[model samples]
Target: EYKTKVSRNSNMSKLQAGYLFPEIARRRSAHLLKYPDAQVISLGIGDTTEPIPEVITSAMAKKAHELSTIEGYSGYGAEQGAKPLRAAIAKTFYGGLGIGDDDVFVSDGAKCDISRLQVMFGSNVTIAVQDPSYPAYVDSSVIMGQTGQFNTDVQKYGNIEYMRCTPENGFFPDLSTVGRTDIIFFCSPNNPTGAAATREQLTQLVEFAKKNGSIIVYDSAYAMYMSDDNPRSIFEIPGAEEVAMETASFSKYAGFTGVRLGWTVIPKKLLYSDGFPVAKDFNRIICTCFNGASNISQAGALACLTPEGLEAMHKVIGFYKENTNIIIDTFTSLGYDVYGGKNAPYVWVHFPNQSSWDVFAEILEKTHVVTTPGSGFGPGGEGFVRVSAFGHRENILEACRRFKQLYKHHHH
Candidate 1:
């Protein structure tokens, strides 16, 4: 079945963008096979080690037990998602941002939606993606026949506009260089960098989209790891609903990566080819391609919005926040040009001498610590590496201490 699925999708040619984390895992696995005793401390992937809140666990357990009986079994479920959970997501997450139930669609994951979004609009869109951005955003565009073949020299494609996120602008992009794009993917509390787009930064893009008839696909999946009081939803920006598409995950926030569930909010006012509202068909698109998330997982997501549920998340997030501080302080003491690790979980560290992969290999071999190479993200990601703060508090600090050791020998 898996081979058939892979073969079925074989026509989907792509830029072959490096999906960083998995490749990191692959290399690490190979390394582990060689050195079985090597205790690899992974600060690579942004998966949380914290326990799922009791609210979620209990709800899931109950739902699972219910599913064991024919009376409670869901042989077929709502493809648009159940009413109560959808209502909670709208009311709790985007209510203040002026998003409504009908505007929000429930799905399995943001990573899934990120790739599936182009399917909603078909081949009539020109897209812009952040350079050194999440691989899914760019690779998905290509799979949908949205972008052109790779330009090896420039490390970009012809059909897609690459917005560079260099150190100059604090890991965010300027829209001026992006030109007129019909679709845009923006990530905040950005993965791999841990950088969040400021309100001014995002609103500027929103304004650009308004003028160009573009749609901003904002991925705020790392919001739980955000240490600052920034807007967790894209709708927080004024006029965002008119021009933006937002998706977030319970994977990082609620520690349900494999459980597979998330939500996307696209306002009803968003338009397409004829300039008429086009959200309805997009809503139908979810039904066509997805049968919605697991009922237990949906229950868990609803629990996540509760006061107690939020408190549990606060404790988990606080641990990552402190780990971020520890990494920033230690890396700063040893003198590395680092971004992130203040407001976001990942710390973007610059390697002064060798390339990022060189640093990645050296770190793993020397310290048995797995870190993500920056170049895997895109062109601008070279010369840098990202360390995840998504580990146990002890593991985070231990990795930092080991990193300092590697830094001292490699630099001084």
Candidate 2:
């Protein structure tokens, strides 16, 4: 019996059975229990296996130690973040884009920032996301009560537009099919599929958003992985400042996953539907809701902009790129269809004759090698699996040998 009426938000009912990584964990736990002696090599989530570099960590250590000194003490920081770190991000990552310290908002991580962005937008806006995209974009929207009831037959929401991504289109969404959306979430060197947008592709996307009056929430957390000639920042495109806001993280780049530092860039030039300033509202949200990222973490993030710091990170990235090559080559030689694993750390394998979940479970059961099922990404990812290359060299090599054994009989 209840003295007062209480209920939960109906939007909670629209989510998938569970978040992707948690579901991955649950399945792995069950598998381990059934086969106690099995050795499971997880290539499921894209987590950094390497330790934080000395250059960055030492800087953080110095700052952390400073707390004991009277002259070195720092208690609370500006919510937009310490001006020094924001300036460093602008100069190091978005140098030529005309971004300033005032334009950036430092955050805990890209995942947290995504939800915060959804909150800033509130629930009365239309949303569109890349099919087979990161779950946070869609899930956050659902939690904010921005989406309508789920339509099972179409495998979409009543309010959200699914921009289908596939090989035929080079994993970029077709703007012609996506008419008028209020907000667009786009990731390059993309999450599940490792496809990076070329200059021409993004040029079209920027112009489309400007034409349709849509605000783009560009996730560039994996931007550092892009090869030469691939565009790293959306601001590299002309006129993108008028419609785009970018979120970048130090997690993958500097192994700061546990350290937790990232930033969101919102140009002062961007505006709302009524011509009000977008950055001003966002600044209000940041100052009111977020105290600020840790001073020690911000110190480390500043060091990441230094020449010595970048050199240290590049060494680690090269190792992961090599691992990605090995996995892609192994699958290709086994006569399987695959995409990505070139510039990005993920390889998306297409299985023309299987369901993604079935493929995931079969691989774990047969080889004791864990992977992320593409179906969890969305409908466009229904028949593929995403293999991550973020692992120690020994584990990756062992997983490769097992994969070869799994397909040994199929070899010509």
Candidate 3:
């Protein structure tokens, strides 16, 4: 039947059933089918729901309109990014940290950049990730053939060190138990847990990476949500430039989730084992593979850095922060142990001795509310559920009311 031999990448086979979000979607669809009239309020995905301020969108519109003029038209831009936008990002986020515009590589978003980073590293390197961290980090590592066979019993891939982060440790893993690896994927104001790292904690992390001679791929996509003194960028830590690369996005900050604009900062001091600068290799990778982020999106990102634009975005962020407070207060009043939702937009609620998937299903079936299962993040998230605060105020308030109704009789 076959004229020539064909094969599939075995690494693809090594992935679990599905990526976490899609699996959540599948279950959501199935639930809807079972109860056609049910009204499901999703507090699951961390997607922005508010309209983007005119200040940001008007800038993007202006860029789009400029394309009609011969003087404003551009076909292919520099793979790195627009010069002005890159400079603005450098000055805005890493101004005094010594990270220059040249070190910034503009990208589509953090999720895409995470995979591109995997491409830059290839498959031969060892890696470590926080247990219960973002799914993209582990999933991308698997796709690149950087991991061994999937372990069903442990619910993890082989050869990847899973650093356990729990309430006891303030959601920061202890470095002493973590063995040295080639790369470390760390997210602060983290995805599922919403835990931000303090100054002392990040200092320890930088020291650990320096000691191990490892490169820390820091994901700070949710950095803008932090309202405290927690360091938002890795470069804020002394000596981190030599060992850290940060990927951040405009998605959460400026309602650019679909508009798609982000950047990665790779310090010039960061080098490979042979003393070759990592930024040079990353630049080569971007040039060879990525054309560039959309120029219109870049225009919007530049707008986001402006004073008026920042004030407008702060209002949007304040709206989400209030939503987070509602979710946190609801959970707290119900006597559940909750973490996060203070300086971050997700609330991690602990349901002791219950499977996270079961809790997710029970809430969906009972109150018609949707949440992300903790185990979908990683093994350490087995008994918790992540409730997102990114939603319209009306829906969030209604969901909170429904939650109170569903658990009225239960305490703790």
TM-score of 1: 0.92
Candidate order by TM-score, highest to lowest? 3, 2, 1
Q: Which tens-of-lDDT digit does each residue in 1-412 have in candidate 3?
A: 6565657789898888867888899999999999999988888988777888888889899999999999999998889988898999899889999988999999877788888899999999989999989888899999999999989999999999999999999899988999889999999988789899999999999999999999999988888889888899999999999999999888865644545887899999999999999999889999887898898988888888989988987888889999999999999999899998876888999998899999999999998899999999999999899999988999999999999999888895
The 10-residue segment with the lowest total lDDT in model 3: 250-259
Per-residue alpha-carbon lDDT of candidate 1 for residues 1-412, written as tens digits (9 for 90 to 100): 3454345443265545456766787889989998999878988767667666677688778888998998888875688777887898888777777777877778887777776677877766788878787777777777777777788888776688878888887777877777888888888877667788878887888899899888888888777766567787788989998898888887766544434687888897788768777677777787679877788877677777789878877777777788788888988888778898877777899885678888899889889998888888877788889888778888888888887877775444
Mind sharing the TM-score for model 2? 0.97
lDDT of 2 by residue, 139-197 (tens): 89888999887777876777888898999988998889886889999999788999898
Candidate 3, residue 71: CA error in Å? 1.5
List candidate 2 segments past 4 Å from native: 1-4
Please list the residue runs of candidate 3 whose C-alpha ends up more than 4 Å from where it truly belongs after superposition: 1-4
lDDT of each: 0.78, 0.86, 0.90
Candidate with maximal lDDT:
3
Residue 269: error of model 2 in Å?
1.3
Question: Higher-TM-score candidate among 1 and 2?
Answer: 2
Error of 2 at 221 (Å): 0.9
| Candidate 1 wrongly placed segments (more than 4 Å) | 1-13, 17-22, 69-74, 255-259, 409-412
